[PDB]
């Protein structure tokens, strides 16, 4: 019904008008606070090196922003040596496009690279939408059979509520401890690049295996990659499930 | 079947094998490029600056990235404004995430946490309202051409991929070709960025690399093209989704 699909669009835009007075009441006093900090950092550092302009001292700060858009670390020699489209990298770039998350910290630059990303997700994100209907399919059985063993409601209401509790023990506690031991994140940081990433939302403000002083293993990409299409997969089928159940309530 | 889902497993293996390896191929001349650029521009700073240490442009360096990854300018003298932050609110919403501007309070992960997590399924909702809306339109439209080869008799089938290329088309002309027009001649963008935006923006991919506005009606009038956008493609992939379970 179409008055139900204008209620729908008043929620909605009632909840990113509650949503954006939130974002802004807890974000905008740090962001005034980082925009006093830079701008005292500049001046102060023109206060000590004389021989600097302020105007020389833009074009440095425009060539390390030029770089890191790029997908350089304008920070040391050091750091340059390694590369961002290496046959693994490149590889879990395509993954991050398919999926739909794009991170962002990776990007095509090349007018060519562009063109082929576009194509590329034209045809590749339907391709991945088949591998997860095929797990979605089989996870659906696995689902099935289990509360067929246990009102239909109350048991299907149970059922629902401790499979959304075993994705969040499997596919979100257990791999956010690994990444705060291993990309060394906070606690919060750790929970909050797991639940962006399976969104598929993907800010790219945490990236897993990201840093150049990360000696990670060769192994480490492509398990994050399969952790991403098991967990993806997963709280699919259960949104299949959800949904699948809502039609048979709506007839 | 399985031995299918192995099937698509493999395809989709070979896929970003196939597509890592262009991607490579096109981009690691560029990045090269630029390292080398980088690398140059800092040593000759140092040069014609012999004042500043090493060390002392490293730290300043790090403090206009620190600047720009909390989302503020490190070039020149808000982005959590009431209209910035409730496109902010719409971009986790829509699962696009651009990540120009993400959450860097503590507090505020934990919200945008809280936010995704109950938000984009009453997105869902609402996606599938203009979907069952537009699934009408699409229905009514397919309903019409058969009537006409009732006596005729030609394969459902092939009225229906006909009808199907036709919507993709309509929306690829109304949401992907004219606002892409529009982002090229107020964001200044060039005819492939326009269109890579576009594309980049409807597949919820959003890699932030190109946002729109960064006039008070743009931010929502883009997020409203973006809700249109989004629901029409989506009412066709549910058409397509649907007459394929027929199939199965
Ligand atoms: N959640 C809707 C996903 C759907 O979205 C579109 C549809 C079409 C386009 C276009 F025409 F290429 F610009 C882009 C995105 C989609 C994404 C990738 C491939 C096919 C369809
Ligand atoms: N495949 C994308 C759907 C998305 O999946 C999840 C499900 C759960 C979670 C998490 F919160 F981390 F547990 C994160 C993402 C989802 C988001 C909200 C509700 C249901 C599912
Ligand atoms: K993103
Ligand atoms: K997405
Ligand atoms: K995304």
Same mark, same amino acid.
């Given at each position: 019904?179409? &008055? ?5 669009? =008043?929620?909605?835009? #009632?909840?990113? =008008? ?16 980082? &925009? ?17 302009? /302020? ?9 390390? @922003? $030029?770089?890191?858009?790029?997908? !350089? ?12 489209? $290496? ?38 994100? /339907?391709? +991945? ?5 095929? %797990? ?6 696995? +689902?099935? *059979?289990? %509360? ?5 409601? &109350? %048991?299907?209401? %149970? ?11 499997? +596919? #979100? ?6 990444? *705060? ?12 690049? !797991? !639940?962006?990433? @399976?969104?598929? #939302?993907? +800010? ?16 480490? &990409? /492509?398990? =994050?990659?399969?952790?991403? @299409? ?15 159940? @809502?039609? #048979?309530?709506? *007839?």
């Amino acid at each position: 019904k179409w &008055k139900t699909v204008v209620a729908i669009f =008043v929620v909605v835009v #009632v909840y990113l =008008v509650t949503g954006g007075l939130v974002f802004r009441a807890l974000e905008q006093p740090f962001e005034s606070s980082q &925009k006093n900090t830079i701008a005292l950092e500049k001046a102060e550092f023109l206060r000590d090196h004389v021989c600097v302009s /302020p105007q020389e001292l833009e074009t440095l700060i425009q060539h390390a @922003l $030029d770089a890191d858009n790029a997908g !350089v670390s304008p920070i040391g020699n050091s750091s340059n040596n390694s590369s961002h489209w $290496d046959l693994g990298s490149a590889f879990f770039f395509a993954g991050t496009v398919i999926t739909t998350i794009g991170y962002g910290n990776i990007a095509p630059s090349t007018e060519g690279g562009k063109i082929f990303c576009i194509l590329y997700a034209i045809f590749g994100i /339907p391709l +991945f939408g088949f591998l997860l209907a095929g %797990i979605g399919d089989q996870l659906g059985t696995i +689902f099935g *059979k289990s %509360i067929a063993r246990v009102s239909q409601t &109350k %048991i299907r209401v %149970i059922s629902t509520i401790l499979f959304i509790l075993a994705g969040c023990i499997v +596919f #979100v506690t257990i791999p956010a401890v690994i990444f *705060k031991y291993i990309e060394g994140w906070t606690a919060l940081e750790s929970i909050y690049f !797991v !639940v962006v990433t @399976l969104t598929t #939302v993907g +800010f790219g403000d945490f990236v897993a295996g990201g840093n150049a002083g990360i000696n990670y293993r060769e192994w480490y &990409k /492509p398990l =994050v990659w399969f952790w991403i @299409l098991v967990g993806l997969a997963y709280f699919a089928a259960v949104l299949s499930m959800i949904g699948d159940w @809502l039609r #048979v309530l709506s *007839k």
